[PDB]
Amino acid sequence: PTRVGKKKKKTKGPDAASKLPLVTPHTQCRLKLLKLERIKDYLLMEEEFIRNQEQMKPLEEKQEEERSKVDDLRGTPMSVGTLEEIIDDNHAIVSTSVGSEHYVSILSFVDKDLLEPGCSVLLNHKVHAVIGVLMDDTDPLVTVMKVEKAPQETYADIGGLDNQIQEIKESVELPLTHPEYYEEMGIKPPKGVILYGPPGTGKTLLAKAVANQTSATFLRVVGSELIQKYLGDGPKLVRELFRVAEEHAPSIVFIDEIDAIGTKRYDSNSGGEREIQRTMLELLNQLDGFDSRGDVKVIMATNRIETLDPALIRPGRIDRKIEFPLPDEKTKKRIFQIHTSRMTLADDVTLDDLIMAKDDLSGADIKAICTEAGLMALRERRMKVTNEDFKKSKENVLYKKQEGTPEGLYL
Amino acid sequence: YDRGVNTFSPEGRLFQVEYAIEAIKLGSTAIGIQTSEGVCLAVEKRITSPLMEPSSIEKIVEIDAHIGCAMSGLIADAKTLIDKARVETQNHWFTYNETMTVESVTQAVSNLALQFGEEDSRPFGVALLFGGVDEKGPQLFHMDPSGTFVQCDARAIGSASEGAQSSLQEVYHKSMTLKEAIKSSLIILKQVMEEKLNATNIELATVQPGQNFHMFTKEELEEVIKDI
Amino acid sequence: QIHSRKMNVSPDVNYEELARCTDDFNGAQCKAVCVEAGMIALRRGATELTHEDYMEGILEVQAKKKANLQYYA
Amino acid sequence: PIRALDEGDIALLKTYGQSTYSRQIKQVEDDIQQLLKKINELTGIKESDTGLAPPALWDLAADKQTLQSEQPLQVARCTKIINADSEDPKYIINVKQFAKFVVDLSDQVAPTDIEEGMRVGVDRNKYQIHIPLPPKIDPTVTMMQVEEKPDVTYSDVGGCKEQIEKLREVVETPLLHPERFVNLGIEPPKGVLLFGPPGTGKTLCARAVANRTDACFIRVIGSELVQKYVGEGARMVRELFEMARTKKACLIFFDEIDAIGGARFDDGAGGDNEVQRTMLELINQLDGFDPRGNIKVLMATNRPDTLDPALMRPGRLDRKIEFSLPDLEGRTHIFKIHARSMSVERDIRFELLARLCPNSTGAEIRSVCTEAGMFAIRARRKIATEKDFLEAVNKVIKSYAKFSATPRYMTYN
Amino acid sequence: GADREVQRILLELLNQMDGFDQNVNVKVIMATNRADTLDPALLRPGRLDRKIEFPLPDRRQKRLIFSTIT
Amino acid sequence: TPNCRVALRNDSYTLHKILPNKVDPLVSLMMVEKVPDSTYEMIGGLDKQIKEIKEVIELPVKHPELFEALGIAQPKGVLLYGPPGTGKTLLARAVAHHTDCTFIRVSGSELVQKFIGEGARMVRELFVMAREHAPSIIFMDEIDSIGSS
Amino acid sequence: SYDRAITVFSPDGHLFQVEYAQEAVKKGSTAVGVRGRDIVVLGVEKKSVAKLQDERTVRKICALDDNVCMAFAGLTADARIVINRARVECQSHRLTVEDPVTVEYITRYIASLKQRYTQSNGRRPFGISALIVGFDFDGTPRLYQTDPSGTYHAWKANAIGRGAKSVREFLEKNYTDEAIETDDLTIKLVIKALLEVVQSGGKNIELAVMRRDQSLKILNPEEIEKYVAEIEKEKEENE
Amino acid sequence: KGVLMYGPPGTGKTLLARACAAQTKATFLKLAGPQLVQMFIGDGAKLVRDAFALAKEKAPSIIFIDELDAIGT
Ligand SMILES: Nc1ncnc2c1ncn2[C@@H]1O[C@H](COP(=O)(O)OP(=O)(O)OP(=O)(O)O)[C@@H](O)[C@H]1O
Ligand SMILES: Nc1ncnc2c1ncn2[C@@H]1O[C@H](COP(=O)(O)OP(=O)(O)OP(=O)(O)O)[C@@H](O)[C@H]1O
């Protein structure tokens, strides 16, 4: 036919948070008192409407004779099995959890179209026959890794990174919101993006900010989540994780610190490194599976790039490599603008002086300065923050790493 | 194996001089054509900054009042070979009252193109084109860091070397004229460079028999560009 | 010549050329030279061999490749 | 001069600064997040499907002809057979997940079709052979023996035609003209491995002649031969090399043989956990059952470490065909490939591009063509210019590859 | 690899000697060759209070070992 | 409930009872259950270091609204360092005695166990066990081990 | 990746030890310089005095002859030798040939001295980069620069030191096609360019000018304070 | 009863041993090296002893061992 199987009959479940990201006074004002009490009104009513929903349903059902007897025709402790192959004569070959394979019958009420090799079924104890097919349900390990809440603030939170923000928005948000541009020239969008650089630069921020403002299903996988010890549990989850990503949305799979799952492929004969390496190999295979990826975007992020397997880094798999350097003396002005916004800044400070004297502190360095200078005002019993608290915060926080320079040698 | 000029390969060879030929490949392109009316010559400047003064970048130097030059590769190696080649023609005039021929210039130049480990240093990183009008008419020659001296009728070196030479064999013949071969040259240049060709990207040099002066074009070059 | 019995070889074979040109070769490689000479004659579709086909087989065994090298006049 | 904070001194901080709206704004935000919770357990919508059928056709099925499948029908398992005996069965059979057993056949069969390496129906208690079954023919081979035309043109992998000419001589010439072999007195070579840099044309030169074969073609996943269960992958590679030698004029393409490879003739081979089950069985059936065959097998990998000299002993594998980089004309051909199918300008020249791509693969050449299009999307364009490609080569090659320090140049012009 | 495995066996030894728990009434007797080599975190008292050097013999102890053997 | 174990009747597989106490294998030295070993006063001569740690543990927990009113994120990580061994443990045991809070002792070398996997997954199983007793302080012994480079 | 000898070519044709010397330039102090209509000028970024030393021995701008100037980067050990050598050559030239030394002749000497010093093993190359300014060759103002490879080269405006790339991009958008006459305007160009310093403290600038007929004129930190005041005053009027 | 063949490469190691039992007919019995190497633990040593004991049951049989340096270490 033209529309064979109508593409797996499957919807997508996106996020449910970002309930109202318009709290825009950001201060002690009666608007935010008025705004949030509106939000309280709509949530109490949606509670009370569904409370009246399970209230005023007089049904008092009586089950059909066919449904009631089949529920007793099947066993009460039904067991979950796995299809392997099919013979259409109302008996096929399935597999148990331990792998014991049985020539069981399949009953003639199972809706005999969903039978595909790999689909999960329900079994009996006496004759182990296929009672009914189970819908494509997964283990609880992957369902934790599906994000429920939009975490944090939007692109206004970050302190000026716009050369690289405009990169990732072209690769992720633009093909979903507006895929007219690509068909105007017949160019496929990029597939994988690696975020790298020195730590404390904002790799995790840009992951959270994209996951804030999106309509995609955002999957959170962190590195060594994905490694287990039951000899097949490694490469099983990659197939399950990208099955979930395929059946659901045009989706975003964020795997963090893939350096813990990939480096240069040594193959010692001991059975400790193979389970790493077999999983390492199949992820790279399931990446370019090419069967039907269905717009699954993959974002990967490490600190060091040099210790990576070059089979990952090559194009065809991953198209974008993005540096996050220690920025400049200019976007520092924006980060000191942002991280000092919600505090009573006294009018004696010149925050440019701190940007002036130094060259290589990061965004996490700035946030630590802003917290420590606030703590120094509490020590000498204040609310506003003088210039001196920033002087003492700069001396206290920074001098722990700075080691090694040839002073006097140059000029 | 290589790591030093005092060492052979099992097959030949160097493996050190081969790497010196590779250092030419990242130079700027340069085309010279030998024609019976005289030898024309062309080069690409590759100017980086507008603050960068353009005439401090030399690609054509004047060896003598009837012999031009063109270089690529390392400038630091080039300024040594230009310095001797002016002296060698000058000593020859001092002891013979005549002009050294274009072929025998490069013999004196190649005699320390090959001295790099032959004492009792590294090889140079520069290829040269020598054009001139001696008593056998106009001549064009070419050398290399291996000192292999040869005569060419129309040569192009630097980067875009192979891309020029394939296109340059298409249009050359024996019965060219000088004004034909100048505009035949810069057609190849704008095909192989990356910028729009103007009066600031290139420069010319022509030597004629009766015109031993003026191995150069000075903003008559603007007239040749619109004659494309 | 024992290993070249089973194929069409041109009967213009100088084994004195084949004796001295071989150096640091075992009979495993000497069998390999004969087969590689026959495979190159299959590439051009020629029915016969030559000593140059063995010399081309010599270049194929230890993966040599020549050119003009502009040091050598 | 350090002082810490007394209990009255806490009350100075906690009081000052909007003492009218402080808790007033806060507990509204506090209990609404409590209310986000209290909706969610109140909703709890989740429901099952359990895969039933509409009762138009199964109500008569749900009669006693379910119990006739409950109590008369059985629960027999499947196994494999090691071997047999003469005049009396004494068959040796592995569950292999349970133990291996010495069993009998049941009375419902004939002892003919109980041959070795066969799926059979096994009793739960007495372990007798009830029904011989097929080896599950045929999704173990034909699901990768696709016998379907792939969408790769002969003009796609242009520029490396001599490496194609090697492969066109090795593969095509015995399969369609084993006649000049008789007219000359030769036999074709029957072993070629591929190795070299990644993204060079390995799968392309495979799939291009898989398009130009009009015949059986098999692509083999490297991790497919790696299995979870011990003694399962060897059983698969049995079934692949048996039912591929049946029909004529077929091709098998091994790919990413790093997982199944390694030198076993040399210092290592101290492995022997389900990788060597696949490996020792394939090298068993690679020779032995192949004098003068019809099905050619090609291997391809990125790592030249995993070469087996026992494979490279002749009889298994003969020729080292590797792939290389294009000189210039191969590259300029490839730029025309990846730019003819997109909205370009009719005046750009590509020989200027391949000057700027000294050591690069067609994977990178494709990446430039996509990236240059991405610069056209940045502004409002619908056709690419010359400088769109020029920024792309700078973005790809002159940024991450083996050249840096561009401003300090001033030694070469 | 595996040299930090040696180094962490030190750290587990240092923890279960002077951690929080202060396992009372257990006694530790150690004996080495040349002990200038080893870790100063061992040699701090509270952990390895007693430092006892054995000389070879000297005179008047050669007499005593001569007596006890003969 | 998340990670909810249930009592299952072993014959017919019926839910006998909701089991409490979600899975906590090998949490023995965690939540020490006996604090008194050394007091707050018997240290001496380290008063500035005592004041800073109380400002980062007791001050954010006893009065969180001070940092909320000031508008900075509260800190959570403290690295103690001293070369010879000078009071590194007493000051931890004093806080262990004087916090009135859930206190976790992890001498970190006990997360290596033997297996691929298992040595990592309990770290995830550690912080959820600290999230259950939600005011919490977790202590590391001797990060010259795991955490090197 | 052999980077441990100076007479070896890379297989793509490089001399990395020459290339590593120019990285040592980038840890040096910045210095800029333009040529004007008649008065040339150059400025440096002077580092902070450490409160307990004399500052007449931290000299970064020197004169070779009575009409040619010098500004460098890199490391002061190798800089002192090249200065002391070039003072001899511009003096010995005057003895052998009775002219004053042109600004083009002395840069060829410094470059050729750095040239022949590169080629032999056991001679670690000079990790400095010089700026040579002089309106000496018959009323014609010129400025050149050098390079640790030994390539003298002529610009019209220049920047070296740490983050010179910001300054060189700054000058191309700032050095007008209007040749800045009224030479305090030309000094106001450099002081504004060095006002885009790595730190721009305002009190950390030393500018040196030459009106093509006088000697070297080191400015004073009251006259230089006057020019910094009018730059901020004229910039406030632009709003 | 133990005579060892060795040289730079083969074609002369196998080839001379191929020449040995070609004209000596006393129940030749070849055996290769990594054919002993199995995933089966000990069936290297089982196959070593059982083939030797089988060759002991034959009266004139000599034993060949091919690439013993694969375990000769
Ligand atoms: N450019 C920035 N603008 C604003 N805040 C920043 C910036 N960079 C870092 N921060 C602050 O630093 C914190 C940590 O940043 P983040 O962890 O995303 O960097 P990272 O590169 O992911 O570091 P790591 O790789 O070590 O996790 C953030 O919470 C953020 O508040
Ligand atoms: N020589 C070439 N000619 C034309 N296109 C090429 C060439 N090399 C690479 N390409 C481009 O790269 C892709 C082919 O890469 P290829 O399939 O060879 O990778 P691979 O060798 O399978 O990589 P790996 O070995 O790492 O799996 C094609 O999409 C094509 O666009």
Ligand SMILES: Nc1ncnc2c1ncn2[C@@H]1O[C@H](COP(=O)(O)OP(=O)(O)OP(=O)(O)O)[C@@H](O)[C@H]1O
């Ligand atoms: N500043 C101090 N005040 C009082 N007692 C101290 C002090 N420093 C050390 N001690 C004594 O030293 C003993 C060990 O102290 P502790 O366990 O802190 O060593 P440590 O600093 O943990 O060493 P390390 O971390 O190197 O193992 C304790 O019994 C304690 O009484």
Ligand SMILES: [Mg+2]
């Ligand atoms: Mg992070």
Ligand SMILES: [Mg+2]
């Ligand atoms: Mg591939």
Ligand SMILES: [Mg+2]
């Ligand atoms: Mg301690």
